[PDB]
């Protein structure tokens, strides 16, 4: 009973020290787990959502909401640990262009989620506000037959959840472009809206 939605309390500074209850180190210890356990939890996720949903579209939106609830957490944790606690620190850039948060994703997010850095990151020549984020080998979903793409939305559900909470609202879809020796390649394309673009249209 400290902060309700009803009032504000007034208590004096330099009073007595209160009790010590719960604390934890924010910086990561290096922890590893097998790929099989997270793959088993991932297929159990897709199995339960296959069980309790009717058609493909709202299944995809529910999986994207599942990814969203990791991404909105993950933004502040990765930026605070890239600016690293009680140790004396200096905060980061807090980047605000479009072309460097995608650089931040392709550099730090994919090398945080996985051992390897993300592969390629190109724009679209035919239209602006379309950005291609591509890998060669999806390590979330390498265990499903390749003709289904909807099970690939969870990771781009992260990316929308990484982007909308960072101040750039957008929308993502994913397709599979079988280019080269990689049969599954998994393009994720990011559709922004107009109302952000003219904002950076206003900023020269």
């Amino acid at each position: 009973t400290v902060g309700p939605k009803q009032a504000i309390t007034s208590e004096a500074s330099t009073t007595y020290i209160p009790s010590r209850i719960y604390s934890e180190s924010l910086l990561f210890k290096r922890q590893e787990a097998s790929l099989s356990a997270m793959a088993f939890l991932f297929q159990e996720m897709i199995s339960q959502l296959h069980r309790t949903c009717k058609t493909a579209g709202d299944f995809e939106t529910k999986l994207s909401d599942y990814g969203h609830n990791i991404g909105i957490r993950l933004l502040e944790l990765l930026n605070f640990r890239a600016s690293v606690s009680n140790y004396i620190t200096k905060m980061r850039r807090r980047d605000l262009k479009i072309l460097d948060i995608l650089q931040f994703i392709h550099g730090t997010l994919w090398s945080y989620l996985f051992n390897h850095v993300s592969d390629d990151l190109v724009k679209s020549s035919e239209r602006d506000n379309e950005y291609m984020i591509v890998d060669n080998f999806p390590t979330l979903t390498q265990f499903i037959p390749g003709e289904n793409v909807s099970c690939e939305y969870f990771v781009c559900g992260i990316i929308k959840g990484f982007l909308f909470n960072a101040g750039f609202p957008c929308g993502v879809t994913a397709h599979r472009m079988p280019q080269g020796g990689h049969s599954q390649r998994t393009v994720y394309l990011i559709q922004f809206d107009r109302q952000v673009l003219d904002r950076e249209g206003l900023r020269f």
Binding site: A39, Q43, H50, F143, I144, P145, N148, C151
Partner: protein
């Protein structure tokens, strides 16, 4: 040694997977493989049932590792889960190598090579295809339990293994 037709049966029913691949021909596959898989399921229990008067112990029941395949899947000699059960069948035209797993699931490799070490390379190969079955079918969410294999990826995971064998 050389493997030419692959069969994966259920632990308690008719078979889930069958491929007569690398025989450049058409043989019949419709509805007699279910009957022959059920008779293998019966006669494994029949072949376990009769006891010759040995009454001793395992003094054994462990191969080694010939580096079959192609970082392999395992680097040490290992153990076996069918002490008193059918292990191969040997005829004029083929030898059938069978390997079951401790959960009750069995794997059948019909081999057109004709006439000890074959058991070692067979148990090594069928343990490797058990590893690819665990790593590529059991992880799949669309695959329900005790249903026919529908994965397209498991196909070129095993075709490449067989064409890496020879």
């Amino acid at each position: 040694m050389a493997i030419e037709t692959i069969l994966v049966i259920n632990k308690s029913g008719g078979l889930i997977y069958q491929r007569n691949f690398t025989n450049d021909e058409q043989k019949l596959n419709s509805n007699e493989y279910l009957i022959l898989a059920s008779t293998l399921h019966g006669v494994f229990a029949i072949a376990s049932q009769l006891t010759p008067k040995a009454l001793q112990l395992t003094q054994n029941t462990i191969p080694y590792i010939p580096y079959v395949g192609m970082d392999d899947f395992f680097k040490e000699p290992f153990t076996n889960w069918n002490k008193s059960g059918l292990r191969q069948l040997c005829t004029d035209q083929f030898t059938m190598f069978i390997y079951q797993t401790l959960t009750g699931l069995k794997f059948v490799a019909i081999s057109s090579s004709v006439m000890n070490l074959a058991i070692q390379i067979a148990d090594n190969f069928l343990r490797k295809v058990y590893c690819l079955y665990s790593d590529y079918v059991m992880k799949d969410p669309s695959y329900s339990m005790e249903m026919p294999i529908r994965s397209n990826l498991f196909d070129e995971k095993v075709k490449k293994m067989v064409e890496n064998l020879q």
